[PDB]
C-alpha cells in the first residue's frame, strides 16, 4: 500500500526517471507497478483536457504536468541506526563551506540527520531508518 | 543595442502569440597539434628543500647569510663531487705545496669587470679553507671552461701558498633524472607550447603578439601552454616612462584575463612563470608566483601560477623553467680554452645542469637582484630535468645536453618587432628499456 501511495503522488517523475534509466542499474518499479503508473498518467490527462482545456483560448490549451506536480523533498530529517561501521561522512550545516566538517558512524549507534547526506548508505544496506 | 534587441524579441513574441626556424628530433612532416588538454594530463611542481609557493621576507638579508649560502653550496656540491670522484681530502688554499694537491672552491673574478683568464680566483670552503681566496693560472690545463660562482675542484701546485698553478680540473656532475610513476605511464602522446614575453612590441601596449599567440593556441589546441614573463615589460617604452592610464597590476590582470578568456575554447592547460621584467611583480630573484582571482572553476582546473625559477612535472616529464636571461648572463662571463667543437651555448647549458642551479653565476648580472637565501632554498634542482626551458634575448635554439632537451624559444618580440615561440611533443619510451631515453621526442621553434 505504501509503495502505491508514492507512485500515485509523483507519477510524472517516476515515469520519466524509468524512461531515462541506463542499463545495469535497478529500476524503482516492478513491471505491474509500471503498468499501473502508465494507466494513471493517461487517465488524469484525459480528464482535465475534456473538462476545461478544450474550451480555453487557442494559445492556452496545453499544460505541462511535469512542471505542475511537485517533487520529493530529499532534505527531510530522519532517525537511523547503523549496522556496519562507516568513515569520513561529510555534514554541511547551512551551505557555507567554512562550516563543513566530517564525522564517523560507529557500529550500533543511533543518529538524527538530513536524508540527502545518507541516501547511498540506505540503498547499500549499511543503515536502517527507525 | 543588445537590450533593445531583446526588448524587440519579447515584443515580437508576445504580439505574435495572439496570431619553422629551428627543429629537433625529426619533428618535420609530423602533424603538430594537441588533444586540447583532454587527455590524462597532470601538472605537479617540485622543489628541494621546498617549492616556492608564495612570497618571502625580502629586502632584509645580512652578509653572514650570503656567506652561509655560498659556503653551503660549495660544501654540498663539493661533498657530492668528492664522493663521485672518490677523493680523500681537500688541502687548504692557504697551504703551500711544491707538488700537486687537490683543492675545493668557487670560481670568481678579482675585480668588477667581466671574467678573463688573467682575473681568475678560486675561493675556498669554510670546512677546509676557512673561506680564503687564491689567484689561479689556468694555462697549464689542457682544457678548461669556467665562470664566476661556479663550484669546482682543482688539482695544482701552490709553492707560495698564495697563487695556484692548476694541473687538473674536475668537472661538475648532474643529478640523477626523475623516475616517473604508473600514473605517468597511463598517458599518451601530448603537445606542450612554450612562449616568453614581452607579449607586446616594446613601443606599444596593444598586445598584438599576445592575440597572435592566443590564435596559435586555439588553432593548434596544445595540451599545456607554458607562458613566461614579462607580461608587462619594465623595459617597454610606455612602461618605462610610466605613461599608461591604468595601474601596472590592473594591466597585468587584463593581460592574464585576455589569455584565459581568449584560450578557454582550446581546453589547453596554462602555466604562468614570472620574470624580473614584470614591472607589476616583485623585482627580486627568485620571484614567487603571481597573484590572480578571475578564474572560473574550469579555469581553476586548467590554470596554474608558478615561481621564477620552477621545476614542473608534466605527465612525469620534468620541465626546468626559468624566464631569466641566464644564457646572456653566462655568455658574458664564461671563459674557456675549448677551441674545438664544444659550442658556447652547449657549455653554458652543461654548466647549468652540472651546477644543479637555475642561477649559479655569482656576482649576478647587473639587472639580477638576487635574494641568496631564497635562491638557496628554491633555485636548486630536485632532480635533473628532462626538458630545460630557458628563454633569452640571444637567438633561439634546441639542444640535447647530458640527456636533457634544452630549449631557448627566444622572446615573443625583439623589442619593437615580432619574435618566436616553441612547441614540444612528449611520449614516454617503452618500459622494457634498460636505460633512460628522452621522453621529449620532438621540438620546434616558430615565429609569431
Amino acid at each position: 500500500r505504501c509503495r502505491l501511495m508514492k507512485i500515485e503522488k509523483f507519477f510524472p517523475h517516476v515515469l520519466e526517471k524509468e524512461k531515462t534509466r541506463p542499463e545495469g542499474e535497478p529500476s524503482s518499479l516492478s513491471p505491474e507497478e509500471l503498468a499501473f503508473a502508465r494507466e494513471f498518467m493517461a487517465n488524469t490527462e484525459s480528464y482535465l483536457k475534456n473538462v476545461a482545456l478544450k474550451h480555453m483560448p487557442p494559445n492556452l490549451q496545453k499544460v505541462d504536468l511535469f512542471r505542475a506536480v511537485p517533487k520529493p523533498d530529499l532534505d527531510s530529517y530522519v532517525f537511523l541506526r547503523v549496522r556496519e561501521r562507516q568513515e569520513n561522512i561529510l555534514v554541511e550545516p547551512d551551505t557555507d563551506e567554512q562550516r563543513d566538517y566530517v564525522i564517523d558512524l560507529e557500529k550500533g549507534s543511533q543518529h538524527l540527520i538530513r536524508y540527502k547526506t545518507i541516501a547511498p548508505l540506505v540503498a547499500s544496506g549499511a543503515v536502517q531508518l527507525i | 543595442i543588445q537590450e533593445l534587441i531583446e526588448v524587440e524579441e519579447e515584443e515580437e513574441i508576445l504580439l505574435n502569440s495572439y496570431t619553422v626556424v629551428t627543429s629537433f628530433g625529426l619533428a618535420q612532416g609530423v602533424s603538430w597539434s594537441g588533444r586540447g588538454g583532454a587527455g590524462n594530463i597532470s601538472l605537479k611542481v617540485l622543489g628541494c628543500p621546498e617549492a616556492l609557493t608564495g612570497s618571502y621576507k625580502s629586502m632584509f638579508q645580512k652578509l653572514p647569510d650570503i656567506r652561509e649560502v655560498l659556503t653551503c653550496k660549495i660544501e654540498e656540491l663539493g661533498s657530492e663531487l668528492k664522493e663521485h670522484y672518490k677523493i680523500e681530502a681537500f688541502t687548504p688554499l692557504l697551504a703551500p705545496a711544491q707538488e700537486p694537491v687537490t683543492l675545493l672552491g668557487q670560481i670568481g673574478c678579482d675585480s668588477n669587470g667581466k671574467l678573463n683568464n688573467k682575473s681568475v680566483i678560486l675561493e675556498g670552503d669554510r670546512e677546509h679553507s676557512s673561506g680564503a681566496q687564491i689567484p689561479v693560472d689556468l694555462s697549464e690545463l689542457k682544457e678548461y671552461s669556467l665562470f664566476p660562482g661556479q663550484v669546482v675542484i682543482m688539482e695544482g701546485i701552490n709553492t707560495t701558498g698564495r697563487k695556484l698553478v692548476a694541473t687538473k680540473l674536475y668537472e661538475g656532475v648532474p643529478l640523477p633524472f626523475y623516475q616517473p610513476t604508473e600514473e605517468d605511464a597511463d598517458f599518451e602522446q601530448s603537445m606542450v607550447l612554450v612562449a616568453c614575453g614581452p607579449y607586446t612590441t616594446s613601443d606599444s601596449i596593444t598586445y598584438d603578439p599576445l592575440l597572435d599567440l592566443i590564435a596559435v593556441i586555439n588553432h593548434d589546441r596544445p595540451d599545456v601552454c607554458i607562458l613566461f614573463g614579462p607580461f608587462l615589460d619594465a623595459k617597454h617604452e610606455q612602461v618605462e616612462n610610466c605613461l599608461l592610464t591604468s595601474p601596472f597590476e590592473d594591466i597585468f590582470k587584463q593581460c592574464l584575463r585576455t589569455i584565459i578568456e581568449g584560450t578557454r575554447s582550446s581546453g589547453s592547460h596554462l602555466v604562468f612563470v614570472p620574470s624580473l621584467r614584470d614591472v607589476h611583480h616583485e623585482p627580486v630573484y627568485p620571484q614567487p608566483p603571481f597573484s590572480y582571482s578571475d578564474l572560473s572553476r574550469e579555469d581553476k582546473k586548467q590554470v596554474q601560477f608558478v615561481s621564477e625559477p620552477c621545476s614542473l612535472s608534466i605527465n612525469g616529464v620534468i620541465f626546468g623553467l626559468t624566464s631569466t636571461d641566464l644564457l646572456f648572463h653566462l655568455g658574458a662571463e664564461e671563459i674557456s680554452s675549448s677551441s674545438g667543437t664544444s659550442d658556447r651555448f652547449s657549455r653554458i647549458l652543461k654548466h647549468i645542469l652540472t651546477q644543479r642551479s637555475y642561477y649559479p653565476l655569482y656576482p649576478p648580472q647587473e639587472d639580477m637582484a638576487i635574494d641568496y637565501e631564497s635562491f638557496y632554498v628554491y633555485a636548486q634542482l630536485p632532480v635533473t630535468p628532462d626538458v630545460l626551458i630557458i628563454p633569452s634575448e640571444l637567438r633561439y635554439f634546441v639542444k640535447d645536453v647530458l640527456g636533457c632537451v634544452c630549449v631557448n624559444p627566444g622572446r615573443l618580440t625583439k623589442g619593437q618587432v615580432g619574435g618566436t615561440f616553441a612547441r614540444l611533443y612528449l611520449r614516454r619510451p617503452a618500459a622494457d628499456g634498460a636505460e633512460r631515453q628522452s621522453p621529449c621526442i620532438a621540438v620546434q621553434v616558430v615565429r609569431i
Binding site: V91, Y101, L112 | -
Partner: protein, 241 residues
C-alpha cells in the same frame, strides 16, 4: 542527546609572570608607543600617590580609569582581554631596557610596579585566588583546616591585629612562621610551633619578593647581554630625561 562540532592558552588569567618569550613580530611605532604610554603610567602612579594616601578607594577608582584609558590588562575579563594581556606582556619586555640606565630609576619603576601589584591583589575575587594559586607555581598547600576554630579562639586571645571574622574572610591556612617573617620577628600575631595561620596577603608579599628577585636578575641580564640588540637606541635619552 550528544552533539558534535587559540589565544586562550597564552593568558588564562590577567595575571602574568613573563616566563615565555612572545616569538612573533612588531612595528616600530607599536613597540615605541607600547612602552612610552607605560612610562606615563609609571609617573601617574606616584602622581596619584602625592594626590592622596596609597591604595584607598580614591586610588582604586582613579587607577582603573587609567587602565581603561590606556588599553592595558584589567581585572580579568571574559571577552578578548587576551589582546591587552599580550600587549602588557610584550610592553613589559620592552620596558626592561629603558630605566635599567640607572639603579635609582630601576628602583623607582619597581616601586610603582609593587604598588600596582598590591592594588591588583587587593581587587581579587575568590575564584581568581582559587584558580591562580593552582594554575601558577605559587601552590602553598593548606593542612588540617578543621583546627582553624581552635585558632579562632587562640588567635583572638593571642593577637591585637587579627579577629575571629578574619579567620574566615581572610581565609586561614597553615604554612610556616618564615612565610610570615615580619610577623614572627616582630612577634605581632599568633604563630605556634613554627607555623603561621596565614591569609593570602602574606603570599602576596612572597610573590612581590620573588618577583623583585627574578626582575633584578633580569635587570642584570639587561645591563650585560643586550649589546647585540642595540642597533638602534635613539629613544634612550628621551626616556631617561
Amino acid at each position: 542527546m550528544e552533539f558534535s562540532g587559540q589565544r586562550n592558552a597564552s593568558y588564562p588569567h590577567c595575571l602574568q609572570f613573563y616566563l615565555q618569550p612572545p616569538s612573533e613580530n612588531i612595528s616600530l611605532i607599536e613597540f615605541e608607543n607600547l612602552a612610552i604610554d607605560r612610562v606615563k603610567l609609571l609617573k601617574s602612579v606616584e602622581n596619584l600617590g602625592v594626590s592622596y594616601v596609597k591604595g584607598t578607594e580614591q586610588y582604586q577608582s582613579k587607577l582603573e580609569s587609567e587602565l581603561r584609558k590606556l588599553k592595558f590588562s584589567y581585572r580579568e575579563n571574559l571577552e578578548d582581554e587576551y589582546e591587552p594581556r599580550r600587549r602588557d606582556h610584550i610592553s613589559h619586555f620592552i620596558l626592561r631596557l629603558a630605566y635599567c640606565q640607572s639603579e635609582e630609576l630601576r628602583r623607582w619603576f619597581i616601586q610603582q610596579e609593587m604598588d600596582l601589584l598590591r592594588f591588583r591583589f587587593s581587587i581579587l575575587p575568590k575564584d581568581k585566588i582559587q584558580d591562580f594559586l593552582k594554575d601558577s607555581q605559587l601552590q602553598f598547600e593548606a593542612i588540617s583546616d578543621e583546627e582553624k576554630t581552635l585558632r579562632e579562639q587562640e588567635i583572638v586571645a593571642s593577637s591585637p591585629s587579627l579577629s575571629g571574622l578574619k579567620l574566615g574572610f581572610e581565609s586561614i591556612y597553615k604554612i610556616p612562621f618564615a612565610d610570615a617573617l615580619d610577623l614572627f620577628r616582630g612577634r605581632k600575631v599568633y604563630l605556634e610551633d613554627g607555623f603561621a595561620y596565614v591569609p593570602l596577603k602574606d603570599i602576596v608579599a612572597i610573590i612581590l619578593n620573588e618577583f623583585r628577585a627574578k626582575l633584578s636578575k633580569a635587570l642584570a641580564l639587561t645591563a650585560r647581554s643586550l649589546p647585540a640588540v642595540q642597533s638602534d637606541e635613539r629613544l634612550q635619552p628621551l626616556l631617561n630625561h
